[PDB]
Structure formats: C-alpha cells, structure tokens
Design a protein around this ligand. Structure first.
Ligand code: NAP
Ligand code: I84
Length: 315
C-alpha cells in the first residue's frame, strides 16, 4: 500500500531514501529535498560515514516544523566491528548523537559477521581476508534487546541474514523481542522468492535494498550486468510511461516489500517518489520475476570464509 505494519504495531513507510555512497557534502540536501517531496523514511548506517550530515538535514526540517519527529521513520545499523555485547550500546549512542535524535525507529545488525573490534571498519590480515572476532550474533542480539528496554530504539531487526541464521535467533532461549525486519538485496536478478516467503511466514517485514542494481557501487566493472540499461525492463518501462528505475521501484513494492532507493540528485529523488500512481500487470510482475539469475551485487567476498558468512546457504 503506502506503508506496512511491523509486529510491534508501528507503521513503516513502504518507501525510503537510501544513503550509502551519498557524499557528506550532498547528503544533507538530499535528505532535505526528500523530506520536502514526501519521504518519511530514511535508511542510514554508521559505516556510511555521513550520519552527522544526515542528522543536519533532519534537524533543520524538524526545527522548521516541516515534519514532526513522530511522523519520521529513521533507521540505522550496528557495524561488524561492534558485535561484542559490551560494545553495542556505545555504537547506538554514537549513531544517536551523530543523527541528533533521542531514539531510533529501527536499529539493525548490519551483517551476521562480527569483525575484530577497532577503528578500522574492515580489519584485514596479510592475505586480504577480514579478521573475525570472538562473538556470536545471538549474544549481540541480547544486547540489541536491552536497547529496546531503555527506549533507545523502537524496534530491532537484521540485515543479510539467511533463513537459518534468523531461526537461530527465533529459537534463542530467553528471547525477549524477535526481529521485526530483514533488510536484504532484492532486484530482478535476485528475486529472493524463498527468503521473503520464509520471513513473511514468520511475521518479519522485508526491506529490499539496491532495487536498481546499485550501478554506483565501487566494485562495479564495465562488463557488469545493468538493470537500468536492460532492453527487456526498458520495454515494460516504456509501455507504462515511466522510467526503468520507476518500475524497478514499483516491482518490490507490489511484492509487498519495503524499498529504499538511493540518490543525491534532486530530480531523481522526485522521480523515485513518482511510483504511487500506477501498477504493474500480473504478467509484467511475472516477466520481471523470471529474470532471476541469483546474481548478488553485494556478496562481501572478503568474508566468504567467516564462520557466519551468510551466502553459502541456499537462502
Ligand atoms: N543493509 C545492507 O547491507 C545494504 C546493502 C546495499 C545497499 N543498502 C541500502 O540501499 C540503498 C540503495 O542501494 P544502493 O545505493 O546500493 O543502490 P540503488 O539505489 O539500487 O542504486 C543507486 C544508483 O541509482 C541511481 N539512481 C537513483 N534513482 C535513479 C533514477 N530515478 N533514475 C536513474 N538513476 C537513478 C543513483 O544515482 P545518483 O545518486 O547519482 O542520483 C545511484 O548511483 C543504500 O543507499 C543503502 O541505504 C543496504
Ligand atoms: C574500501 C574502498 C575504498 C575506496 C573505494 C571503494 C572501496 C570498496 C568499498 O566501498 N567496500 C565496501 C564498503 C562498505 C561500507 C560496504 S557495506 O557492507 O556497508 N554495504 C552495505 C550498505 O550499504 O549498508 C561494502 C559491502 C563494501
């Protein structure tokens, strides 16, 4: 519809602004423009290194009475070097101060993999492998639970977790709050029909990230598949009087999933918002779902050997 409901009752905006790779000196204005066009959901993370700049845009719009804190849905995430129980609260407070907020609407464990603690976000060894830590994400979750108890966050969830890892939390003895969301990569080349189905059956909302394939990702190579430049999608896109992107955003929304496309360009930030006026054909929906080639543009290959790497499993 226009929003989905988490198992806690909270209404979560079906659409949101993504901020990974949004330069600090451009993200403040992108947030400002979005809050002005109608966006009420902003997706952030400590590891993006721009939460401070994101916090300024929110502060200015909240101070100008343009938007009420309670109509805003702000999400952030706990980074891998902060999985150790005693390190979780600090990381949450840091993100809170940087964004200039009293609480978060949703706080997610970024990846199931914990890295050796430190200032370096990706601590590698001589072989270019990321160094892991001595923690399990089940103990990290218990600390995420305290956050709710103290009112620092309204809800907690996971990101890039496989159905077996989620199950590990769902069956944790002494479990207080279960995950409300699972943010995962979902685009035509990776429709995730199985993980979504598993999540839904458990009452967990699914947020789809990189809905456009993330053509601006660092590792993207000249010979890399392109979702925005695919004749087929452009075809269904043309017959709708919309753009490839506008349809790529409607697709995950029609499947009952939350989407968070990213753009620091005001014109696209508005076009990304022009997707609540139309609909896709039950067949058009099927044509897209069929392009699934299990191709993830985000597989953290440097973590492939981590005991908790999530992508060795089917789903
Ligand atoms: N939880 C996780 O591990 C995870 C992983 C990956 C991504 N994410 C999240 O999902 C968000 C989106 O994913 P992403 O940044 O990887 O990629 P994305 O939104 O799929 O793609 C971003 C690219 O699309 C362009 N674009 C946006 N709207 C467009 C439009 N209407 N027409 C043509 N081009 C357009 C952007 O350009 P400009 O910006 O230059 O306009 C940008 O280079 C992130 O910012 C982040 O919040 C989360
Ligand atoms: C290290 C580096 C330096 C200069 C240019 C590119 C890169 C590679 C790079 O950007 N790696 C990378 C960084 C982050 C920060 C993530 S991530 O895990 O943060 N992405 C998930 C998200 O957007 O939340 C990933 C997967 C790769």
């Amino acid at each position: 519809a226009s929003h989905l409901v988490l198992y806690t009752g909270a209404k979560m905006p079906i659409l949101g602004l993504g901020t990974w790779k949004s330069p600090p000196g451009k993200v403040t204005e992108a947030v400002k423009v979005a809050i002005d066009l109608g966006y009420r959901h902003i997706d952030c993370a400590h590891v993006y290194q721009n939460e401070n700049e994101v916090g300024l845009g929110l502060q200015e719009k909240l101070q100008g009475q343009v938007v009420k804190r309670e109509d805003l849905f702000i999400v952030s995430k706990l980074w891998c070097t902060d999985h150790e129980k005693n390190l979780v609260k600090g990381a949450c407070q840091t993100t809170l101060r940087d964004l200039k907020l009293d609480y978060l609407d949703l706080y997610l464990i970024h990846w199931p993999t914990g890295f050796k603690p430190g200032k370096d976000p990706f601590p590698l060894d001589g072989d270019g492998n990321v160094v892991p830590d001595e923690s399990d994400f089940v103990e990290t979750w218990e600390a995420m639970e305290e956050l709710v108890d103290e009112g620092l966050v309204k809800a907690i969830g996971v990101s890039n977790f496989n159905h077996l890892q989620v199950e590990k939390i769902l069956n944790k003895p002494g479990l207080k709050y279960k995950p409300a969301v699972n943010q995962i990569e979902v685009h035509p080349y990776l429709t995730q029909e199985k993980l979504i189905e598993y999540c839904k059956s458990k009452g967990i909302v699914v947020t789809a990230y990189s809905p456009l394939g993330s053509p601006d990702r660092p590792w993207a190579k000249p010979e890399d598949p392109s979702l925005l430049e695919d004749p087929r999608i452009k075809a269904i896109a043309a017959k709708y009087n919309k753009t490839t992107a506008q349809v790529l955003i409607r697709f995950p929304m029609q499947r009952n999933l939350i989407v968070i496309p990213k753009s620091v360009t005001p014109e696209r930030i508005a076009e990304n918002f022009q997707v609540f006026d139309f609909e896709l054909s039950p067949e058009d929906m099927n044509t897209l779902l069929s392009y699934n080639r299990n191709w993830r543009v985000c597989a953290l290959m440097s973590c492939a050997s981590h005991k908790d790497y999530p992508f060795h499993e089917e789903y």
